[PDB]
Structure formats: structure tokens, C-alpha cells
Amino acid sequence: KPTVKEIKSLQNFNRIAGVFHLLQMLAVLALANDFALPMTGTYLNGPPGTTFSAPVVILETPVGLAVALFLGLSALFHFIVSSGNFFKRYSASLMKNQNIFRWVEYSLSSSVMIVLIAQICGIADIVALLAIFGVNASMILFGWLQEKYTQPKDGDLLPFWFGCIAGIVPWIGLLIYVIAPGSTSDVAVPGFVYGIIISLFLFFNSFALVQYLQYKGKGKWSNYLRGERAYIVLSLVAKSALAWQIFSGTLIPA
């Protein structure tokens, strides 16, 4: 049973994560250049099975603003959950092995992040980016249903496994683009792009491992609160790591 001291400590950690992300959000908004990545349409120039027009730019992702957005969403929800006003709802949810505000935040913030990673890899088709956003959101919503309908140690991981099936799809997409089957150019994928894909792939797998460990509920993971803390650590570090790598790689003259 989660005590009042334990919940209050978790609220404090949420607040700390919020301040880190809010300050990083300010730093990116202030310091970032106007680097932009295109969303494109490559339209038929006749009936299906004929030829295509050249890709056209439909809109440009303002990368600095998009990084600020996933940091800002994190700050907002970490601050909401940390509030004394929310202690009762937070306590009640943790008692039921749930944190719904976590999934609401992740469904938006992690989806912004994987779209930015896709664009940094050169994925530009607007339907590719929309469907990556949608399938990544679906991964999060499956994790939400795992918490809503199961309890740790009840032997039921079906929603979790559905989440893994949805969750892996964007990463298969990235792997296809970095392999670049049929490519004519001899240009290498930049080192900093490999850094982003590999480090954030590891972070995304870490989130899945937290839910798996929580719902297996073996050893120290029998205590749901250990997973709650792990999620805060992973969201703090994953978001800060992606923001810094995008900033360092694309948003400064250096």
C-alpha cells in the first residue's frame, strides 16, 4: 500500500523533472536557430500506375519550437501531478497501479519526439509522419489499457504486447530509411543522426521494460512506486538527451 510520505516524495520528483524540462524549454526557445524540416506530398501526375509529380513541401516543422513543445508538455503534466490539489487523485490512481496523466502526456510528447527523429532521418511524406504520430500514440494508449484493465502479477500482458507491436513500427520505418534500399547517393547518414536513433531506441525500449517489470511484479518491481519513479527518471533523461542531441546537431551554428 502506497503511504503519504512515498506519494509526497514522488510528487517532489515530478516537480524536479518539471523544472529541468521547463528550463531546457526556455533555453531551446531562446538559443535555437530557425532550422526547419519539410513535410511533403508526392502526388500522382495522372491515374494510379502512371507517374508522380516531384515532391512538394506542404509545411516546415520549426524544429526548435517542436523540441520546446515536447519539453513543455513534460513540464505541464509533471507540474499538474506534483500539485497538492492533485495529491488525492494521484494517491488514488497509484493505489490502483495507474498514472493516467503520464499516458496523456506521453501520447503527445513521445509522438512529437518520434516524428522529429523520423524527419531528422529524412522521412518527409506528410502521411508517413501523421501515421508515425498515430501508431506511436497507439503504443502509449495500449500501455494505458494495460494499467486500466490488469494488475501486476495477474499473468495478463495482452495490452502491453499490442503496445510493443504498435511501438516498433516507427523504428522499422527509421531502419528502412537509414538502410535506404535503392539509394543512388553515396552520402553517409551523419554520426549525430545515428546517435539520436540508437540512444532514443534504447530509451524507448527502457519505457517498455518498466511496464513489463511492473506487471511481472517480481523482486523490487512488486512495489508499483519503483516503476512510477523509473518512468519519471526515463522521461527526464530521454527528453533531455533528445533535446540536447537535436540542439547540438541542427539548432546552433556550431
Add this chain to the structure above:
Amino acid sequence: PTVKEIKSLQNFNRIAGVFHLLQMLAVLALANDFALPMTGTYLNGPPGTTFSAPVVILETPVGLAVALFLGLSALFHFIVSSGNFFKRYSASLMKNQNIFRWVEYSLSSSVMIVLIAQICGIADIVALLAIFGVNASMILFGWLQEKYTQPKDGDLLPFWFGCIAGIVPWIGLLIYVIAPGSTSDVAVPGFVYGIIISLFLFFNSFALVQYLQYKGKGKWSNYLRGERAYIVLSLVAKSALAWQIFSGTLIPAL
């Protein structure tokens, strides 16, 4: 529900199987070798600079892909109609569940929406992969609605998640038919509009069946009515798409 009522649904599954198997044969025998490309449009400079011309990675053999969604339907309709599955089928129906329906739909409806996307000129391989994944996710949410909720309990959360995932490919189609930023106003063929509009209505009809079942008002309080509606919709939707694709693209000798 009466044993007779279930034997009846067994019979209806068999009838649907025979129609789809015969249509599968007809398409395999009669269809031309019409193919739709899956493309990669790779960076040929650092992120935020230049792209190579799109390259064709592979070609969807449209006749074989139509035969595949008809064949998947025939296979699962035959599996569930078997006297050897009558216990497992009856048992699941008794619990307001049909897992074999969702397993089939997760593959067959995903092949269908990818084909519709390609007919609309969506070609980027990540667009088509992520459309497959988000459409499969829509089906898996429908499965979780049946697994975890009871009709009339007021809980449609998995259903609404399925709607969020489910609408994403259709927003994609709408973007490609509007073709924002296009250099010219290239006409979408009438038969393509027929396919998008008819199958959008069919896809909405599937969602309405689950909604009606879990609201559980009127005759829809009887789960077997929805089981029957799903068989009718999968029979008609698949036959309608197969005929429209065949008539639109698979007739002329190439």
C-alpha cells in the same frame, strides 16, 4: 443464445468463406499484373538540405494483394465455421468475444487500407508501413473492448482509442486527394473516389456495430446480432473493394 442460433452463424461464416474463396480464384485467374510502387525519398545531403528523386523499393502486385485479403477472410471464416471449433467459437460468443475475427481483420483490413492508400498515390514505404500499423492498432483496440468490458457498463475507452487510431489513414487519404501545395490540379479518377467513399462508409459501419453492441440498446443487446452484422459487413466490404479495384485497374493487358 440458442445452439441453433450458433449453428446458424457457423453456416453464415461458411457462406462468407465460399464467396471470398471464389472471388479470390476469379481475381488470381483474371487480374492483369498492375502494380503500385513503394518508394524511398532519401536525403542526399545533411538533414535540412537536399533529397534524391524518389526511388521505387518494391511494387505491390495489386491482383495478388486483393487475392490476399479475400483469402485471409476465407481462411478465418472456414476456421471458425468448423465443427471442431464449434465449442471454442460458441464459448467465445457466450463471453461476447470473437478473437479470430480480430486476428483476421488486423491483417485483411490493413492490406485493404494500404491498397486504397496506394490507389490514391501514397507510395512512401514508411507511410504504407505506418498506415498498416495504425490500422492494425484500431483492430487490436476493438479486441481489447471485447476482452475487458461488458455491454451496457458505460466503458467505451478501448473503442474510442480504436476510433483515434482508425481515422488516421483516412485523414492521410483526404490529404492526398486534396493535394495541398500541388503544382497542378490533377484529377482523381471517379473510380478512386468510389473506392475511398464506399470503403470509408464500410469502415464506419464496423465501428458502429461495436458501438451499438456495447451501448447494448434495442436488438443489439443480443451479441449474436453484431456477430452476424460483422460477417455481412466483411463479406460486402471485401467483395465491394475487390470488384472496384479489379474493374478500375486489373482488366487491361499490360
